[PDB]
Amino acid sequence: SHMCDAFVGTWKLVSSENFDDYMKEVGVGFATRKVAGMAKPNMIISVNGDVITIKSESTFKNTEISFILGQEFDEVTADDRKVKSTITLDGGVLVHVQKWDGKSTTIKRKREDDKLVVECVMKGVTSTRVYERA
Ligand SMILES: CC1(c2ccc(Cl)c(Cl)c2)C(=O)NC(=S)NC1=O
């Protein structure tokens, strides 16, 4: 009975576009870009009361965030950035802003047909990562 019901579940990466260029823009170094770009993560989303948990599991890294919408938290990203994150729901889209070293990136997650579409933006550079139910 929402929040976020249509996001909850276990999702597997099925396509990616422009992720190397997005990672370059973020500042990810060569070796991490190569290994991270190979990964085929599973994204596991769950909700318990007001707390949303998003796990990413791959051969590269396992990460986990738990958060309340609108409430800032500290996140260590898969590429080892120490960021301050805030996630909100905007018109049915989860909007995740990460701030670090005067920089910012925004990750949007939305349901489109049977997919979960993730759009990662850093300045002018967008990467689109498509997940399907596992
Ligand atoms: C693990 C992952 C990510 C995101 C940004 C960077 Cl920069 C890196 Cl290295 C890895 C990913 O591979 N794909 C998605 S959609 N979410 C993530 O949390």
Counting the structural domains of the chain, the total is 1
What is the distance in angstroms between the CA of the first residue and the CA of the last residue of the chain?
A: 22
C-alpha angle 21-27-31 in degrees, rounded to nearest 5: 80
- Residues 64, 67: Cα–Cα separation, whole Å: 10
Residue with tokens 């597997």: 12
Q: For residue 115, what is the domain's CATH number?
A: 2.40.128.20
Sheet with strand 103-112: strands edge to edge: 62-67, 51-57, 42-48, 9-17, 125-133, 115-122, 103-112, 93-100, 82-90, 73-76
Q: What is the CA radius of gyration of the chain?
A: 14
What is the SS3 assignment for 80?
coil
What is the SS3 assignment for 30?
helix
The DSSP result for 63-126, as a single string, is EEEEE-TT--EEEE-TT--EEEEEEEEETTEEEEEEEETTEEEEEEEEEETTEEEEEEEETTEE
For residue 6, CA distances in Å to 44, 111, 131 come to 12, 7, 13
DSSP secondary structure letter of residue 78: T
Q: Which atom of ligand 1 is nearest to the CA of 120?
A: 15
- Resolution of this structure in Å: 1.0
Residue 11, φ and ψ in degrees, nearest 5: -125, 150
- Residues 110, 106: Cα–Cα separation, whole Å: 13
Residue 127, φ and ψ in degrees, nearest 5: -115, 135
Q: Which residue has a Cα nearest atom 3 of ligand 1?
A: 78
For residue 3, cis peptide bond before it (omega within 30 degrees of 0): yes
Under 8 Å between Cβ of 63 and 77: yes
Q: Which amino acid is at 54?
A: I
| CA 91 remoteness from chain centre | 18
- Residues 132, 51: Cα–Cα separation, whole Å: 23
Ligand 1 centroid to Cα of residue 14, in Å, is 14
Q: Which domain holds residue 110?
A: 5-130
Take residue 49 and report the two structure tokens written for it: 């009361």
| CA 31 remoteness from chain centre | 20
Residues belonging to the binding site for a fatty acid are: 129-131
Take residue 73 and report the two structure tokens written for it: 């938290």
Tell me the sheet residues that pair with 107: 96, 120
